[PDB]
Design an enzyme around this catalytic site. Structure first.
Site, PDB file in Angstrom:
ATOM      1  N   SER A  75     103.157  -4.159  60.868  1.00  0.00           N
ATOM      2  CA  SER A  75     104.577  -4.470  60.760  1.00  0.00           C
ATOM      3  C   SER A  75     104.976  -4.772  59.292  1.00  0.00           C
ATOM      4  CB  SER A  75     104.938  -5.666  61.671  1.00  0.00           C
ATOM      5  OG  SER A  75     104.299  -6.858  61.240  1.00  0.00           O
ATOM      6  N   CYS A  76     106.284  -4.850  59.046  1.00  0.00           N
ATOM      7  CA  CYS A  76     106.796  -5.140  57.718  1.00  0.00           C
ATOM      8  C   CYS A  76     106.388  -6.588  57.322  1.00  0.00           C
ATOM      9  CB  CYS A  76     108.325  -4.926  57.610  1.00  0.00           C
ATOM     10  SG  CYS A  76     109.418  -5.879  58.747  1.00  0.00           S
TER      11      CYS A  76
ATOM     12  N   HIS B 161     114.322 -13.894  58.597  1.00  0.00           N
ATOM     13  CA  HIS B 161     114.596 -12.473  58.694  1.00  0.00           C
ATOM     14  C   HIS B 161     116.076 -12.014  58.644  1.00  0.00           C
ATOM     15  CE1 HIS B 161     112.111  -8.875  59.569  1.00  0.00           C
ATOM     16  NE2 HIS B 161     113.259  -8.367  59.979  1.00  0.00           N
TER      17      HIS B 161
END
Ligand SMILES: NC(=O)c1ccc[n+]([C@@H]2O[C@H](COP(=O)([O-])OP(=O)(O)OC[C@H]3O[C@@H](n4cnc5c(N)ncnc54)[C@H](O)[C@@H]3O)[C@@H](O)[C@H]2O)c1
Ligand SMILES: NC(=O)c1ccc[n+]([C@@H]2O[C@H](COP(=O)([O-])OP(=O)(O)OC[C@H]3O[C@@H](n4cnc5c(N)ncnc54)[C@H](O)[C@@H]3O)[C@@H](O)[C@H]2O)c1
Lengths: 332, 332, 332, 332
Positions: free
Chosen positions: D148-149, D176
């Site tokens: 994932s990022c 986020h």
């Protein structure tokens, strides 16, 4: 031309950036009593809306060095004390928003500046809009104004529509991105109460003389235009909404044609034209003064139509300040 | 009158909320194949923009109990399969947005519902706007539409201005708040490319038939109004910007006089009037369909003016749906 | 008790609003050189985040009349000049944020004021947090501080966790809503450069002494807590993120039980408790100083956990200022 | 190396953009049975957050032509049917977020492709993070995941900190930016009630397995890390907040030393380092996987510290997908 810039705010910094990104003029001095050298490096280098500066920004030997060019820095509250003459600055961009009067802005000449360009509307200084009336400028004018960002977006469009169809009367509305004059949360604004309300939470009605000012750069339209504005929670990029009654019948297709022709010719770089499904962000850092949005507008009949045009209120205007100085220099 | 509501989205929930705080209209059934009983308790109880519900909400014996009143919950995807009759729903509020035509909304009548109110514009169902043309409704109409939120804001104002000065022609723009139809970040929208762009980052142009619809609830204005919209990053509350040509000369003060008088009389509760320095948030949860902003508007001359009116696109409209049903019941 | 308030900003206005809601204290005087009587009516009446004031507010014969009670208005730029005593103000709420020192806040005394409550952290004035150490106040204290909004959120939670399990060490992060100190667009902020960047566009790191201050109201925790903050683009309501190591083993269910019992007993109204799927807006206008979010937190093991607690940074704190004054009056 | 990309969403478009912005790989096919060729031109050309594509995007003879390079377009719904083989697509980037499993993603191999890279965490496919464990990849792996990022932001930092001081245990919080998974206004999201609430209005708590996943790319950390997230109203760019206990005593300056050397050496281009007063927007379009913010972090003592690292969740990750493929190709 060698240029000096007074005030290192949004306008001062973007005009400087434009001078460097376009290479059209050479900034050799900057004055700001509240922002010191090292802070200038930071503010010019990092920009929330336009991105990090493409090039170099360093503080070397008490000077601001951008792309290798050293810039003399001044810290004067009273512009009359700024030695622009010694710095080699021929033109001075007055962008503080505090010396917009012929008299106040004149203070710069007392330091060596040959000419002063006010990056804001002026009550008595002659105003010019690139592509509309800049050829009315002459060497006797030592102090000039580049009008407002909104006027620079409406004037180009108004000129094209009026020349071809004749604007009987018009009312404009500009949906504007939040500005520095606004507040983050409900705060004191004294003069304009609505402007003190939380910027990110509201759609805020505001007055604007931009539409009326178009009647000054386009005399035939004097008294035929006025409008107001709505400040909305977007960081940058605004849009003009012009509702006007036309003298000569004009199908919407002919309006698009006429504007398109203007954007590809005499107003290239000033007035843009698009038929794409654009939104405000698509114009971020766009150097046009105004970009006609064909698909967004709508006509009721051949004589009553609503025209839409976009403008990066920060970038477009800053580039016009540079374009105005280039034209002036070519007239010296 | 006992009411049933199809779709538990923003409108379905707000109409239900409006009903419970009102009185003479009782919600006794709700249908939504996508939102289960326990989730309904949560969505109805907590509301980001209008605050936590003032009262009680619970899940008991398979029913949604609001303020003590038990409500029958259905989960049909086909409105033809909803047993509104057994649940006691005489009127059904069709708020899903996917059954806006006469042919589709009629499905509710299969389960026993007697009348259906479409909480959205309809291509063939007769549309009504409280305070403007609701008197035209009669007992033969089994399926009706309450038009759009924007039409409910412009119609009341248009009626007053046209009655007193005569609207020759007009063009409106609605600076509209974010809606459930938009995307959080640049996403797909194959039908309307612009609506797929990041909602919070942009000012998004969009088409709207709200202005043209006013010509349907006010026949004399048919073909004299049209407009478009700009979606901006605010959670709720929108504003109508009407630029119109008047037949009879009207000083701005006379317009203020007439509108104000209408808001205190025949249009009380529907059309509001203010001279205060208001901003969008000041209309949060305001039940008016339209609130004239005296100070925000501006006139060019006695025959050409820009009028501004606010509307909580969610709350105002939801209350009109309830008011429309109350009127209908009084005609049974 | 007769209360006077200096500074009519977010806190001054909300403290006044909190005061009128519950006849705990009676505001009888207000001072602010930047906000004239009529402007006060407007600012107090309309609030973007907390809604229109429910009640009445008017400017009568030179006084601000709220819910009928007339309030003496002062426009003194210097605290010392303010004639608090005359107007009949026993306690004075110092909320300008400029006179937070013992030396400076004492000026109100020179005007007749008996006690002074600083609505902000103080470098030398004794600080108190309702529910944590307010029992340490005594009649010899003429000048006190109610600490910060963030300290009031962390302290209640820290006390309960430390009392039951013992906090060996902890680090907190508070994701904070924007404040009046931030800028709408990249602007100057000499002392804190990051704070000058566009508030609505960025997540902005910032320093905060709120965690360290908790060691002041809870001595056993001195030197065991510190943290930082992130300012994000929300109008109001913030959240504390406490990561701490525990001395005594604690299952997450035990932490929940212990916090829940504290919120229903000794810390009722101060520390809240919820297991619902809440988001920031669910706490708008919530009067708690801190509300434990059971489902949001997470534990790595019985000695290392991350605890989450919400707080309306504006409303909660403003109510604690009133609660602190009520406690003080009961000790006079 | 020639590449195919399945899914033209945020990831698919940015990976494609990264591929041309670097020239490390060459995109020769795009499969998305839901986006028409002409719509692709529009979505790839205009980007709200990253700006207009700095190149060319046409649509010549049924193909998407970017920078004078034709790309075959597919509208196949079952990966197996795509003709990657005929087109010359050696590797396929699976970015729909649907075919993540070792088998679902395997559907591409039948089409003639040699290797599949899943641009998302996988339940059974081996995951790799450039700079952390990419050297563990070998030619027998036909299906891989780039994690994932968030994992790509935490892993590089966690590796450096663990390698030099030893991470006993840690808990992270990731603030986020807004994602597509979110809703513009309170809408249905039954799996996760909080993700359905208005994105622009709230700070939304959410779960994330990014911290736990770091234990899979750095085995020694298995079971020593976990965390959660907060969704905030910013368009792009997020930040990792890591609170960890260190084995070996480490002054804050030693941490800076070690992270800085790592960013100038082995992790150059992957892990960045800064001491400037940065905010989220300063990392827009930044290609690093993680950028240590020296001034933002804080330490309680030599064994308990809070470390802050920025990441453009869109751009960084997209560039790592390209870097992963380049590494794979070099192992062929
Ligand atoms: N909120 C506003 O601004 C506003 C005001 C004017 C009119 N409207 C109209 O209201 C309608 C809905 O708007 P909204 O904001 O409540 O939308 P949501 O907020 O989209 O509400 C729609 C609800 O319909 C439900 N639904 C979908 N398909 C269904 C089916 N087959 N059967 C039963 N229920 C189904 C959904 O689960 C959802 O809860 C639209 O027609 C819109 O044009 C909206
Ligand atoms: N809102 C919050 O998040 C919050 C909550 C906890 C504590 N605080 C503290 O509250 C204080 C004020 O914050 P705020 O948000 O209300 O600020 P504003 O919203 O800045 O309020 C301050 C008010 O002080 C007035 N003022 C300025 N100079 C003055 C002078 N010389 N004499 C009298 N009045 C003067 C201003 O006109 C303004 O209305 C600060 O010290 C802050 O740290 C803020």
């Amino acid at each position: 031309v060698k240029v000096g810039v007074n005030g290192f705010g949004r306008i001062g910094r973007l005009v400087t950036r434009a001078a460097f990104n376009s290479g059209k003029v050479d900034v050799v001095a900057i004055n700001d009593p509240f922002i010191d050298l090292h802070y200038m490096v930071y503010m010019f280098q990092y920009d929330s809306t336009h991105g990090k500066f493409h090039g170099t920004v360093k503080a070397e030997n008490g000077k601001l060095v951008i792309n290798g060019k050293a810039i003399t820095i001044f810290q004067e509250r009273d512009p009359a004390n700024i030695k622009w003459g010694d710095a080699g600055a021929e033109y001075v961009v007055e962008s503080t928003g505090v010396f917009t009067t012929m008299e106040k802005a004149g203070a710069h000449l007392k330091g060596g500046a040959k000419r002063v360009i006010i990056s804001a509307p002026s009550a008595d200084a002659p105003m010019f809009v690139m592509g509309v009336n800049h050829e009315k400028y002459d060497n006797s004018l030592k102090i000039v104004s580049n009008a407002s960002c909104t006027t620079n977006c409406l004037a180009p469009l108004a000129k094209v529509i009026h020349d071809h169809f004749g604007i009987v009367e018009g009312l404009m509305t500009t949906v504007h991105a939040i500005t520095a004059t606004q507040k983050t949360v409900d705060g004191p604004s004294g003069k304009l109460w609505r402007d003190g309300r939380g910027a990110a939470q509201n759609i805020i009605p505001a007055s604007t003389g931009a539409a009326k000012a178009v009647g000054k750069v386009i005399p035939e339209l004097n008294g035929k235009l006025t409008g107001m504005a709505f400040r909305v929670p977007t960081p940058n990029v605004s849009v003009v909404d012009l509702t006007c009654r036309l003298e000569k019948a004009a199908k919407y297709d002919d309006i698009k044609k006429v504007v398109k022709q203007a954007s590809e010719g005499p107003l290239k770089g000033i007035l843009g034209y698009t038929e794409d499904q654009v939104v405000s962000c698509d114009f971020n850092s766009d150097t046009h003064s105004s970009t006609f949005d064909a698909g967004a507008g709508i006509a009721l009949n051949d004589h009553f139509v609503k025209l839409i045009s976009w403008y990066d209120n920060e970038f477009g205007y800053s580039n016009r300040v540079v374009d105005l100085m280039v034209h002036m220099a070519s007239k010296e």
